[PDB]
Design a protein around this ligand. Structure first.
Ligand SMILES: *[C@@H]1O[C@H](CO)[C@@H](O)[C@H](O)[C@H]1NC(C)=O
Lengths: 49, 48, 49
């Protein structure tokens, strides 16, 4: 579910926020991304990649 | 700050409250100390 | 094949087996009365699932 504040548990990574389509592109070895302050900012879907 | 991890969610989902309380307390102490330092610096700079 | 096995190696040659690419249900092991000792360090026994 997207565009709604939800609790998410992505492959054991728990949190709360809004999930949305990402313009960023991940190399085919990276699983999640972090900001300049190292705050989690993106996640790769285990079932959709 | 001496805790097992720097993420509160990991500590919460990995440990029971009686044993996670110590780690949460260490994180609270560290973050409170950092916030007080920031507030004091801001007060001095605001006076200037 | 590890818990319910017939041969257990010697203590100084303890047998290590790697577990990956599967789904593990620790609740059935923890709730079973067959084990007389079940203690976890760095994680609680009810949160492995
Ligand atoms: C199963 O995994 C494959 C490979 O990632 C994926 O393409 C497919 O959509 C998955 N199927 C289901 C039902 O999730």
């Amino acid at each position: 579910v997207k565009n709604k504040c939800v609790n998410f548990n992505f492959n054991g990574l728990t949190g709360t926020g809004v999930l949305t389509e990402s313009n960023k592109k991940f190399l085919p070895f990276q699983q999640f991304g972090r900001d300049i302050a190292d705050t989690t900012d993106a996640v790769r879907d285990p079932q959709t990649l | 700050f001496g805790a097992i991890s720097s993420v509160l969610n990991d500590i919460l989902s990995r440990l029971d409250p009686p044993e996670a309380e110590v780690q949460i307390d260490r994180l609270i102490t560290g973050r409170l100390q950092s916030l007080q330092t920031y507030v004091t610096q801001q007060l001095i700079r605001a006076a200037e | 094949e590890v818990f319910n096995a017939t041969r257990f190696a010697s203590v100084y040659a303890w047998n290590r087996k790697r577990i990956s690419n599967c789904v593990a249900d620790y609740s059935v092991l923890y709730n079973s009365a067959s084990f007389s000792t079940f203690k976890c360090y760095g994680v609680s026994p009810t949160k492995l699932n």
